[PDB]
Amino acid sequence: MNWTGLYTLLSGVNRHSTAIGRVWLSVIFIFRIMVLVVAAESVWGDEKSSFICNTLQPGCNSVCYDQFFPISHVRLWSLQLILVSTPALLVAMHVAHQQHIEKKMRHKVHISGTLWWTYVISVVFRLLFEAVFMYVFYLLYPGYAMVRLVKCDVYPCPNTVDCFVSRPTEKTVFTVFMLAASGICIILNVAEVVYLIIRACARRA
Amino acid sequence: MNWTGLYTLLSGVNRHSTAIGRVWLSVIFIFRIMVLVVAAESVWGDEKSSFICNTLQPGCNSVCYDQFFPISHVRLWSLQLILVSTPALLVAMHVAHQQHIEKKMRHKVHISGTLWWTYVISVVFRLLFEAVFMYVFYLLYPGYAMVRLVKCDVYPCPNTVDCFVSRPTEKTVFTVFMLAASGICIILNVAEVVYLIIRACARRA
Amino acid sequence: MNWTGLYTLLSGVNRHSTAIGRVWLSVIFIFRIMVLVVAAESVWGDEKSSFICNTLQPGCNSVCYDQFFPISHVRLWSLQLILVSTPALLVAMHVAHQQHIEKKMRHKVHISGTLWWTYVISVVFRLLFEAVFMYVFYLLYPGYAMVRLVKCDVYPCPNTVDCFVSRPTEKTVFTVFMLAASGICIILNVAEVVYLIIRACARRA
Amino acid sequence: MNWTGLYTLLSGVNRHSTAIGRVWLSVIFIFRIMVLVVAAESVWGDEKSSFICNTLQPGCNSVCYDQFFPISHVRLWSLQLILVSTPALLVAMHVAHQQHIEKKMRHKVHISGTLWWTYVISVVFRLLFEAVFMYVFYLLYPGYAMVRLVKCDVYPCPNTVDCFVSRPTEKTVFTVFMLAASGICIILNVAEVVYLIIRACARRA
Amino acid sequence: MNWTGLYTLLSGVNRHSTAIGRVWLSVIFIFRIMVLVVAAESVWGDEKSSFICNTLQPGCNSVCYDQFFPISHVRLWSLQLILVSTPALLVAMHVAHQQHIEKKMRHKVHISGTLWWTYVISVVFRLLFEAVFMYVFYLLYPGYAMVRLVKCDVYPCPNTVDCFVSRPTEKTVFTVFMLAASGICIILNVAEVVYLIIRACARRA
Amino acid sequence: MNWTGLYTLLSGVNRHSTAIGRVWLSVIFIFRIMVLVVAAESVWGDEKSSFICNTLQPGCNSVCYDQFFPISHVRLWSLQLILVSTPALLVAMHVAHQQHIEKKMRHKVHISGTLWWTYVISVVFRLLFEAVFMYVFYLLYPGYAMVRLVKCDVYPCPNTVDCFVSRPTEKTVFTVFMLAASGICIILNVAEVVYLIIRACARRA
Ligand SMILES: CC(C)CCC[C@@H](C)[C@H]1CC[C@H]2[C@@H]3CC=C4C[C@@H](O)CC[C@]4(C)[C@H]3CC[C@]12C
Ligand SMILES: CC(C)CCC[C@@H](C)[C@H]1CC[C@H]2[C@@H]3CC=C4C[C@@H](O)CC[C@]4(C)[C@H]3CC[C@]12C
Ligand SMILES: CC(C)CCC[C@@H](C)[C@H]1CC[C@H]2[C@@H]3CC=C4C[C@@H](O)CC[C@]4(C)[C@H]3CC[C@]12C
Ligand SMILES: CC(C)CCC[C@@H](C)[C@H]1CC[C@H]2[C@@H]3CC=C4C[C@@H](O)CC[C@]4(C)[C@H]3CC[C@]12C
Ligand SMILES: CC(C)CCC[C@@H](C)[C@H]1CC[C@H]2[C@@H]3CC=C4C[C@@H](O)CC[C@]4(C)[C@H]3CC[C@]12C
Ligand SMILES: CC(C)CCC[C@@H](C)[C@H]1CC[C@H]2[C@@H]3CC=C4C[C@@H](O)CC[C@]4(C)[C@H]3CC[C@]12C
């Protein structure tokens, strides 16, 4: 597991990506993966059982947890990580496939231009996915701090029982870490698009 | 774990598959595997215990869960993934075996034609398996949204107790993701069959 | 993890096995392993706790589960998989050992004949093990469908309490899959024996 | 993970071991490891909780389980596997060390003789360990069949409550498998010692 | 997994780091990782359930644990390990990227100087992160010894119930180990900065 | 995973260690690791829950377990294994670093002498750590046999309730195994120091 291998794997063997994607984006992906793993394995553990309510009627706890947490934070970050990693996977497979096609046997200039457009559009899609997940996170959970207690009131629960959230401060810390990682990813993606466009326009002149 | 190795592994070292199977189908397989892993490990966890009913007679919960969920979604997707991956496995083993037979020592043209027919029939079988699992999913679970509560009524359960489903919205989200992945796989398989047939007929002329 | 490596590993580097064992038998072994893993990890989970009875006397549930399920299906398939995989392991080790002995330094014709007989006898033993496990499965569990409820009556259980089986339809589906895989393995083993004998007799003439 | 690598790893790169140790002993070790893994992971699971007694005084179940099962079967087989595998590990390390010493720079004949004696004594120790564990198994658990129920009577338990054993028939099956594997290992070890001594004496003449 | 590979991986292939970072810092990182793994897997296990209170009102235990342990020690050390490992990751990626850029085709002297400044600033950031986490640990948990029992008093808990901490002495031991590892890391980082600055100034003269 | 690789990895690529450390010490480390893994995974499982007391006041069990078992045996052996393995890790990193420094470009004689002193001092530290952990084990747990029942009397526990220890005989067996492994490690370390000193003094003459 040498460093050249890990760097090449995270780079995607893409000859158009600049140092922002080669170094900073890959590092932040590693950082976000590690934080997500820690949060998933420890903080949001059996989150169904951790979320407790002062009630005795069966099923009241389950409905309240679904009502106040339609999607748990880790699952949303898991989906976000998968979705934003998909265009990178597509670009890597495209590069590998083009290498294979070349290996079977100018047209190479056309291939390079196609790869350039593919990478730029992939970064734009990655930026859009990050922005969409950020907006979804804002829509589901206003603010950045985990709620401590909630006043649940739903059909299986009579008398408007109140429920408590396990590890609220710890979850707030990890929420800030994940949001910060996503925000910096957005900044880097915008920087890559601008840098590539500027360099391409300068080369055109 | 270089990208050439992963691309070759997912391709099956099949010289007749086009860029649709080399790139798009493999990527969607990776995407579907990751979503399934997340859903299996977190969303559909101890699904037997999550599905709860407001009753005290032992065994009522188990029978109700079996009555309304004959096959849980993850198991159906697990079987679907195994079944649709089987023809790809068969083609890969056929290619490896033909390479071995050649390595022991025109007939190679006949081998190439046999591989071509094998791949085309394998894609047709993969398409049929995807369609069958899609129809089974429609038959077992009408619609695309997880039911929130059900009115169970079976022998161990008196008085027609009602049961609640854990994480209904989250399960709906993953259901849509899995259905979308399966649908795009169907589209790509049809495209590969049409593309191969068109190219073969053009070559015949 | 290239395809040549996986194909060679499953083949056993046996120069007498035909395409049936190289391709079809190995694929079905992979398929059976995957289905067994899914069934073991999810379907037959904590099968002791899943099997429930409407009784309060401690130990009644344990005795009833032992009385109606002397050996759980997954353990039987696990033992079956180990036993039927053993002759393949023996042949692979024999081939490796013969290569080592040759590497230390006609007699090679005698070695080839010994390997031929070893492979044929190994396939016969594999067929016998499959048939024996099939008969044992028939003897323990008549039919192919998991029982839904049973009327247990044993010493710790008074009043002949009835017990329920968790996930009966899902277990039936996996039972059919495992039985089908075993049946096709039997067919392929018979085909290999017949094909080898026919080819050997033809070569004798 | 080629077959030559696995065969070499299990052989210990020992040039004095005959085909019995290269092939049959290694295969039985693999078989015993797999059966032990299955038994440990499934059959003897939370064996403390599975062993149940019809009593309410806390700690009675724990003392009864300790009183009738001083050492659980899997732990005894785990210790047996470790102990009988230790001399093989010692021989492998000795061979590697001798290769290293040779690599630093007849004396090689003396080295070969020392390796021969080391291997023979290691096999004798392996045979003794197998016999000792077999005798211990006989001493702790007379017979070969798991007891179904026991009549416990110890200080925390009043009124001589009776306890039940979970999965008795399944445990009996695995016990027979493990005992059979150990017995065949004893036979093979005796055969190796006799074969080596006979061949050495014949060479002396 | 040879020693040269592990040493190179932990070194980051950085040609400016001295023997302090190559040897001592990497060893302490390994030591800290192992201690953290042991503490996470065993000592701080289901820490939510281990922390118990003599009360019956649901949710009181959860709020008390959050009130006295806003962030559990393992999570804080996990975040600390990730944060202090990040600059090392950045330097490694920078070195790999510079090697790639060189591989595409004095400027190399400028590259070496940039790498030198990058490494020095990274060590300073690593030192600052260690100091910040040390101060946070002091702020959250005064002293170095785990509290045995606490007198919780919060809204869901009436009558000021008292709670007990599981494994206090064991947690104290691991706390001292982790604090000692962090302290020595601080000392080594300061030593590296001073050594590099002294050597650079001497070279300037 | 060839034997040369494993032997080299456990040796540390140290050219001054004799056959005692190359072969016997490495083997005993492997043996101790395996026994510790078995004990940790099975014997000392959820040791908090296994240790039970005949009481109903919450938290009494936790305090009693902490009072009679300040540090559980597996954690002590885990810390012991980490601590005694640390000097071996330091020597391996030193050798790798010296190889790297040599690779950058008599002084080699000075390097060899420094490595010799480093190894000797490391063995002395390893011996001291083993002796210290042995004394700590004696201090915490007099004797070698696990206590069966204890008479706990602490603040949360009224009336001096008695507690029982799960699997006392099994834990005694593993305790003897671990103590024996540590004792033989002490003997081998003393032998290595004496052998190296004797050989060095003889070479001086
Ligand atoms: C610059 C940054 C964003 C690059 C991100 C690249 C990441 C997302 C890529 C690089 C290598 C990829 C991995 C390569 C191989 C596998 C094995 C496969 O069986 C599951 C997916 C998995 C694990 C891939 C997931 C996506 C992955 C981790
Ligand atoms: C174009 C797409 C559909 C190709 C899909 C290829 C997938 C289904 C193939 C490619 C490599 C294959 C894997 C190769 C090796 C192994 C190891 C074996 O012990 C279990 C099965 C497993 C894990 C295979 C499962 C099927 C697999 C993942
Ligand atoms: C044609 C078909 C039936 C061939 C079947 C071959 C199977 C049964 C063989 C091929 C490779 C073998 C594996 C090779 C290596 C190991 C590692 C060892 O530590 C445990 C057993 C295990 C995992 C073997 C189990 C048996 C195995 C999986
Ligand atoms: C002929 C038969 C009896 C040979 C038996 C050889 C077995 C016992 C040997 C062969 C290879 C050995 C393994 C080689 C490497 C490791 C990694 C180490 O970190 C733990 C022990 C472990 C897993 C060894 C355990 C013992 C082992 C499995
Ligand atoms: C001198 C000391 C401080 C160097 C510390 C280097 C450590 C922090 C570096 C060296 C190798 C790195 C690992 C290399 C590869 C991977 C795989 C990736 O999928 C997750 C992160 C992970 C596991 C990295 C984490 C950070 C890591 C462990
Ligand atoms: C002669 C005897 C005492 C030598 C003992 C050497 C042992 C203690 C050394 C040899 C190889 C080392 C391992 C090499 C690589 C890694 C990976 C790292 O991410 C965690 C630590 C770990 C697992 C090391 C732990 C210490 C280790 C196991």
Tab-separated table of C-alpha atoms in Angstrom, chain A residues 25 93 114:
chain	number	residue	atom	x	y	z
A	25	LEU	CA	-10.161	16.816	-2.886
A	93	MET	CA	-13.914	4.013	-15.751
A	114	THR	CA	-13.652	14.253	-24.888
